[PDB]
Design an enzyme around this catalytic site. Structure first.
Site, PDB file in Angstrom:
ATOM      1  N   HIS A   1      -7.450  -1.187  10.760  1.00  0.00           N
ATOM      2  CA  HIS A   1      -6.765  -1.776   9.622  1.00  0.00           C
ATOM      3  C   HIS A   1      -7.630  -2.890   9.066  1.00  0.00           C
ATOM      4  O   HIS A   1      -8.370  -3.511   9.801  1.00  0.00           O
ATOM      5  CB  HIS A   1      -5.455  -2.381  10.090  1.00  0.00           C
ATOM      6  CG  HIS A   1      -4.574  -2.885   8.979  1.00  0.00           C
ATOM      7  ND1 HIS A   1      -4.450  -2.243   7.774  1.00  0.00           N
ATOM      8  CD2 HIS A   1      -3.718  -3.931   8.926  1.00  0.00           C
ATOM      9  CE1 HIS A   1      -3.577  -2.881   7.018  1.00  0.00           C
ATOM     10  NE2 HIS A   1      -3.110  -3.904   7.700  1.00  0.00           N
TER      11      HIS A   1
ATOM     12  N   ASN B   1      -1.455  -9.619   4.653  1.00  0.00           N
ATOM     13  CA  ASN B   1      -1.266  -8.188   4.824  1.00  0.00           C
ATOM     14  C   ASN B   1      -0.837  -7.505   3.470  1.00  0.00           C
ATOM     15  O   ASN B   1      -0.647  -8.156   2.442  1.00  0.00           O
ATOM     16  CB  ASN B   1      -0.265  -7.946   5.964  1.00  0.00           C
ATOM     17  CG  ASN B   1      -0.485  -6.603   6.689  1.00  0.00           C
ATOM     18  OD1 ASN B   1      -1.332  -5.815   6.323  1.00  0.00           O
ATOM     19  ND2 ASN B   1       0.318  -6.342   7.693  1.00  0.00           N
TER      20      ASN B   1
ATOM     21  N   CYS C   1      -5.525   0.611   3.274  1.00  0.00           N
ATOM     22  CA  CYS C   1      -5.675  -0.786   3.669  1.00  0.00           C
ATOM     23  C   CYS C   1      -7.046  -1.327   3.293  1.00  0.00           C
ATOM     24  O   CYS C   1      -7.167  -2.444   2.794  1.00  0.00           O
ATOM     25  CB  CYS C   1      -5.466  -0.935   5.187  1.00  0.00           C
ATOM     26  SG  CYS C   1      -6.452   0.141   6.217  1.00  0.00           S
TER      27      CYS C   1
ATOM     28  N   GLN D   1       0.821  -1.241   0.000  1.00  0.00           N
ATOM     29  CA  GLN D   1       0.000   0.000   0.000  1.00  0.00           C
ATOM     30  C   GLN D   1       0.841   1.272   0.000  1.00  0.00           C
ATOM     31  O   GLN D   1       0.325   2.326  -0.285  1.00  0.00           O
ATOM     32  CB  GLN D   1      -1.052   0.021   1.132  1.00  0.00           C
ATOM     33  CG  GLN D   1      -0.506  -0.295   2.511  1.00  0.00           C
ATOM     34  CD  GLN D   1      -1.540  -0.226   3.629  1.00  0.00           C
ATOM     35  OE1 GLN D   1      -2.038  -1.252   4.107  1.00  0.00           O
ATOM     36  NE2 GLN D   1      -1.851   0.987   4.070  1.00  0.00           N
TER      37      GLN D   1
HETATM   38  C1  LIG Z   1      -5.468   1.491   6.868  1.00  0.00           C
HETATM   39  C2  LIG Z   1      -4.632   1.096   8.083  1.00  0.00           C
HETATM   40  C3  LIG Z   1      -3.178   1.330   7.836  1.00  0.00           C
HETATM   41  O1  LIG Z   1      -2.869   1.704   6.727  1.00  0.00           O
HETATM   42  N1  LIG Z   1      -2.193   1.176   8.783  1.00  0.00           N
HETATM   43  C4  LIG Z   1      -2.364   0.767  10.047  1.00  0.00           C
HETATM   44  O2  LIG Z   1      -3.463   0.424  10.625  1.00  0.00           O
HETATM   45  C5  LIG Z   1      -1.135   0.748  10.701  1.00  0.00           C
HETATM   46  C6  LIG Z   1      -0.223   1.176   9.722  1.00  0.00           C
HETATM   47  O3  LIG Z   1       1.129   1.293   9.989  1.00  0.00           O
HETATM   48  C7  LIG Z   1       2.140   1.327   8.959  1.00  0.00           C
HETATM   49  C8  LIG Z   1      -0.817   1.502   8.391  1.00  0.00           C
HETATM   50  C9  LIG Z   1      -0.622   2.962   7.986  1.00  0.00           C
HETATM   51  C10 LIG Z   1      -6.374   2.662   7.256  1.00  0.00           C
HETATM   52  C11 LIG Z   1      -5.629   3.848   7.863  1.00  0.00           C
HETATM   53  N2  LIG Z   1      -7.428   2.188   8.136  1.00  0.00           N
HETATM   54  C12 LIG Z   1      -8.687   2.272   7.733  1.00  0.00           C
HETATM   55  O4  LIG Z   1      -9.038   2.745   6.651  1.00  0.00           O
HETATM   56  C13 LIG Z   1      -9.714   1.736   8.659  1.00  0.00           C
HETATM   57  C14 LIG Z   1     -10.052   0.336   8.187  1.00  0.00           C
HETATM   58  C15 LIG Z   1     -11.249  -0.244   8.943  1.00  0.00           C
HETATM   59  C16 LIG Z   1     -11.010  -0.357  10.453  1.00  0.00           C
HETATM   60  C17 LIG Z   1     -11.648  -1.592   8.378  1.00  0.00           C
HETATM   61  N3  LIG Z   1     -10.897   2.573   8.675  1.00  0.00           N
HETATM   62  C18 LIG Z   1     -11.017   3.631   9.471  1.00  0.00           C
HETATM   63  O5  LIG Z   1     -10.171   3.979  10.252  1.00  0.00           O
HETATM   64  C19 LIG Z   1     -12.292   4.408   9.422  1.00  0.00           C
HETATM   65  C20 LIG Z   1     -12.140   5.711   8.626  1.00  0.00           C
HETATM   66  C21 LIG Z   1     -13.436   6.232   7.965  1.00  0.00           C
HETATM   67  C22 LIG Z   1     -14.283   5.136   7.311  1.00  0.00           C
HETATM   68  C23 LIG Z   1     -13.190   7.287   6.874  1.00  0.00           C
HETATM   69  O6  LIG Z   1     -12.604   4.684  10.787  1.00  0.00           O
HETATM   70  C24 LIG Z   1     -13.424   3.724  11.530  1.00  0.00           C
HETATM   71  O7  LIG Z   1     -13.550   2.566  11.131  1.00  0.00           O
HETATM   72  C25 LIG Z   1     -14.106   4.289  12.779  1.00  0.00           C
HETATM   73  C26 LIG Z   1     -13.984   3.453  14.093  1.00  0.00           C
HETATM   74  C27 LIG Z   1     -12.995   2.284  14.054  1.00  0.00           C
HETATM   75  C28 LIG Z   1     -13.639   4.338  15.307  1.00  0.00           C
HETATM   76  C29 LIG Z   1     -14.521   4.065  16.512  1.00  0.00           C
HETATM   77  N4  LIG Z   1     -15.537   4.593  12.454  1.00  0.00           N
HETATM   78  C30 LIG Z   1     -16.218   5.320  13.556  1.00  0.00           C
HETATM   79  C31 LIG Z   1     -15.640   5.383  11.205  1.00  0.00           C
END
Ligand SMILES: *[C@H](CC(=O)N1C(=O)C=C(OC)[C@@H]1C)[C@H](C)NC(=O)[C@H](CC(C)C)NC(=O)[C@H](CC(C)C)OC(=O)[C@H]([C@@H](C)CC)N(C)C
Ligand SMILES: [K+]
Ligand SMILES: [K+]
Ligand SMILES: [K+]
Ligand SMILES: [K+]
Length: 215
Positions: free
Chosen positions: A162, A182, A25, A19
């Site tokens: 993630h 991953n 992710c 990525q």
């Molecule tokens: C991908 C995760 C990622 O790239 N990385 C890590 O987790 C650790 C890393 O280290 C190198 C790399 C950078 C991204 C950042 N994560 C997401 O997109 C998540 C994936 C889901 C959990 C399946 N999504 C979110 O964070 C999401 C964002 C919105 C949809 C725009 O937020 C939520 O899911 C939240 C919730 C978990 C918080 C209570 N929800 C309320 C929107």
């Protein structure tokens, strides 16, 4: 359910991807799920495009994050089921910023008609995967940076952050485990995979499990 499954051994999973500096992710999770589904529908294994989601799915947030469910929804309700091939919409977000979206004539490498949602129950997720193949799942991956192999038994499992892909399990072992693909290159972990213990909801792995449907 069988004692162990591993869809990689059935040629149903593509090479481990990367990525880059993009928080996409969710894209790699969702797309990998579709890649496997298409093959298991009887078509050939084909790299599909995460860049399509990152750039054109507007309900999610590109490199700032998203959700596999939304992505399956957007593909079906906004992109007529079309998942473009990677060759046709290559990945360009590895530097961190995501290009705009423009679409004469891309090659559809797969057609999904919907998605399903699995229960928050590891035995139920495993029974489904045993029959229908890799499952998109969310995890808490804050304990993962430091991972270099083995079965994780003490995953920090506090908050989802993630998306990854479950591609097998092994209930035969002394410590049963999931097998997870991953997207941080093959440098990371067990050639780009991680095993985590199965049956203790490690990394909240059962909390948000889903799959695309080739129909
Ligand atoms: C991908 C995760 C990622 O790239 N990385 C890590 O987790 C650790 C890393 O280290 C190198 C790399 C950078 C991204 C950042 N994560 C997401 O997109 C998540 C994936 C889901 C959990 C399946 N999504 C979110 O964070 C999401 C964002 C919105 C949809 C725009 O937020 C939520 O899911 C939240 C919730 C978990 C918080 C209570 N929800 C309320 C929107
Ligand atoms: K058997
Ligand atoms: K559910
Ligand atoms: K735990
Ligand atoms: K679910």
């Amino acid at each position: 359910a069988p004692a162990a499954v591993d869809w990689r051994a059935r040629g149903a999973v593509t090479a481990v991807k990367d990525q880059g500096q993009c928080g996409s992710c969710w894209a790699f999770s969702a797309i990998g799920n579709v890649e496997c589904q298409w093959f298991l529908a009887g078509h050939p294994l084909t790299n599909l495009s995460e860049q399509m989601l990152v750039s054109c799915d507007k309900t999610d947030s590109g490199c700032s994050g998203g959700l596999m469910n939304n992505a399956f929804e957007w593909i079906v309700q906004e992109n007529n089921g079309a998942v473009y091939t990677e060759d046709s919409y290559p990945y360009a977000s590895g530097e961190g910023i995501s290009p705009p979206c423009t679409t004469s004539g891309h090659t559809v490498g797969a057609t999904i008609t919907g998605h399903v949602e699995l229960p928050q129950d590891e035995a139920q997720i495993a029974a489904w995967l045993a029959v229908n193949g890799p499952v998109a799942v969310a995890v808490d991956a804050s304990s993962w940076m430091t991972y270099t192999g083995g079965v994780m038994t003490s995953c920090v499992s506090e908050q989802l952050d993630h998306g990854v892909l479950l591609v097998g399990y092994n209930d035969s072992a002394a410590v049963p485990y999931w097998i997870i693909k991953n997207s941080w290159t093959t440098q990371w972990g067990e050639e780009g995979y991680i095993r985590i213990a199965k049956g203790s909801n490690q990394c909240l792995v059962k909390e948000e499990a889903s799959s695309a449907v080739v129909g």
